[PDB]
Amino acid sequence: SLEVSVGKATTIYAINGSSILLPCTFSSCYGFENLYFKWSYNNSETSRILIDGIVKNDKSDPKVRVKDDDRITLEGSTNNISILLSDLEFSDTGRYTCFVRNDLNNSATIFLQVVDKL
Amino acid sequence: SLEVSVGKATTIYAINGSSILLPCTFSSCYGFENLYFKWSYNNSETSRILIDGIVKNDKSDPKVRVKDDDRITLETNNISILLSDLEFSDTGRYTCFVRNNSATIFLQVVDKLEKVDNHH
């Protein structure tokens, strides 16, 4: 089997007020334990946590524990931890980091540029 | 043995006259040899295979076989090509396939103002 992909980092442009999906799927040929992940947000000034979560196993799916932005929604059918950020605002521009945990310490980065409707 | 990806498709906005890196990476959990890869360019006016070659294995750098113009070169085994001195004509769909799926990059060449309206 093979897993060809674009990489861990991509840039994405989205219209203010719309919804945007920040993608992250992960793969292990190992098979695994409980598997921890989290979405953080960064800019020049500060950084906040968006959601954290767990996949009980490859046979189950990614489920969320912590949620600090009600606009975040995690849904996807490679297990996929992509999230859908709704009700976009201009201050949502920044870097969205998705970190994963069975050592393991792999992260995916999404640079999100919010633009106006013209 | 944990790999993360932001998908098999992305869009890339690139600056005219600048240089862009078109990313493709592949993972496997078996050792592989003679893994053949190709890059194809698809445009409204034309379709063409950019470059191809093989990664002999995880040991070595990839060996390019079919070469494209002067202006595509090659860089967790990494197949990403670098496109230098972009021109608007380079806009199109760049697809990287690894023969035994593929990653698709939709490259839009643009230009940027120095600033926004009236800076300090």
Author numbering:
A (entry chain A): 30 to 106, 111 to 135, 140 to 155
B (entry chain B): 30 to 104, 111 to 135, 143 to 162
Lines quoted from the article behind this entry:
Voltage-gated sodium channels are transmembrane proteins responsible for the generation of action potentials in excitable cells and play important roles in the propagation of electrical impulses throughout nerves. They are complexes of a pore-forming α subunit and auxiliary β subunits, designated β1/β1B–β4 (encoded by SCN1B–4B). In this study, we determined the crystal structures of the mouse and human β4ex proteins containing all three Cys residues, which revealed the formation of a dimer in a parallel arrangement, mediated by the intermolecular disulfide bond and the exchange of the N-terminal segments.
In this study, a slightly different all-Cys construct of the mouse β4ex protein with a C-terminal tag sequence was prepared. The same parallel arrangement was also observed in the previous monoclinic crystal form in addition to the anti-parallel arrangement. The anti-parallel arrangement was not observed in the cubic and hexagonal crystal forms, probably because PEG fragments were bound to the trans homophilic interface (hexagonal form) and because detergent was used for the crystallization and the C-terminal tag sequence was present (cubic form) (see “Experimental Procedures”). The parallel arrangement of the β4 molecules was mediated, in common, through two types of interactions. First, the β4ex structure forms the intermolecular disulfide bond (the S–S interaction) between the “unpaired” Cys residue (Cys58) in the loop connecting strands B and C. Second, the N-terminal segment Ser30-Val35, which is deleted in another structure of β4ex, is involved in an intermolecular interaction between the two β4ex molecules in the parallel arrangement. This type of interaction is designated hereafter as the N–N interaction. Moreover, in this N–N interaction, the N-terminal segments form hydrogen bonds between their Glu32 and Ser34 with Ser56 and Thr54, respectively, and join the β sheets of the counterparts.
